[PDB]
Each structure stands twice: as structure tokens, then as C-alpha cells.
Design a protein that fits this description.
part of a larger assembly; 4 chains; mainly alpha; 2 helices; 53% helix; 0% strand; Major capsid protein (chain C); viral protein; C5 portal vertex; enveloped capsid; Major capsid protein
Chain lengths: 49, 46, 49, 49
Amino acid sequence: VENATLARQALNRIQRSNILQSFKAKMLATLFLLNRTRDRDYVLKFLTR
Amino acid sequence: ILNVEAMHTVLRALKNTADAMERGLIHSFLQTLLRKAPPYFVVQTL
Amino acid sequence: FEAIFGTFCNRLEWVYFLTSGLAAAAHAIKFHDLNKLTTGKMLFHVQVP
Amino acid sequence: LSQAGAHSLTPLSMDVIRLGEKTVIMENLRRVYKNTDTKDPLERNVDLT
């Protein structure tokens, strides 16, 4: 949902490279929620996301 | 059922056509707006 | 002597599928002859904007 | 050119903001562009050297 793509849309090389870069960022950035932080607004924005 | 399917197809095609025409008018309006818009720093300096 | 007091059974707490919130996840219909189907696929008359 | 649009009004809900006697409409365009085939022209590419 961060990069505008669907199932029927074909993908270029650099688009998938940015997909994998966001994978490598977000697998480490938000792996564990209740282990790292306990801010109310962050968990609320997580559930909204 | 073939007349039913043809009528259903042409009505959903024309409805999608009208809504896509409206979306394209929105898009061309936004394109003209972003073409005729300097950024913040230009008008702030001015 | 020795005393044996009131014996206690486990009064089982019941549970139903439509009572919990997971029935708000799906739309469950009841079919009467499900074993007769080889396979059935559902079509999606999907338009694209 | 201002002889157009007289006697025609309707109420409609959209969010405003108050910035020092300036009341501004605020409105995003994901609703007009979700499940589409063209990227939204507000999603811009910018070069830096």
C-alpha cells in the first residue's frame, strides 16, 4: 500500500528494488511492537495503518 | 440471456466511461494547477 | 470413619461459532449436499477504474 | 465571466482549517485514485545532483 501497485499491474525493475529496500527497512523497523516501545499514539497509528 | 448480458455490459461500460471521464477531468485540472504553481521558496522570496 | 464430601463435576463453559467475533470475520452459509461437489469456483465481475 | 453559477447551491461536508483569518479547505485524493492505472500527479519525482 506504500507503493501504488496491485496484482494486475506489471512491475519494473527499480520499482521492485524499492519494494525490496522497503522490505529490508520495515522488517527491522517494525518487527516487534510491545517489545520495543509503549507509546500510545504509535500503537494507535499502527492499528490505523 | 445474451441480450441481458449485452445490455448489462454496455451499461456498465458507459457508466465506467462517464466516471473515468470525470476522473480524467480532475486529473487534467490538477495537472494544469501543478504546472502553473511555483514552489514555496519562489513566492516566499518574492 | 472417614468423610466423603460433595463430589464436584466440571460444569463445562459452552461456546458457539456465531457468538464470538470471528463470525463477524466471515459470511457463513449452510449447504446441504457439500460432499457432492467436485469443485466450485466463484467468479468476480470486477470493473477497474 | 462571473455571470455563471447563480441561484445554485448545495451543502456538502469537507474539512476546513483556520490559519490567521485564512480558512482553507483540506482534502486528499486517495479516494479518487485507489484502484486506478495512472499515478497521482501529486506523487512527483524530484531530482537532486
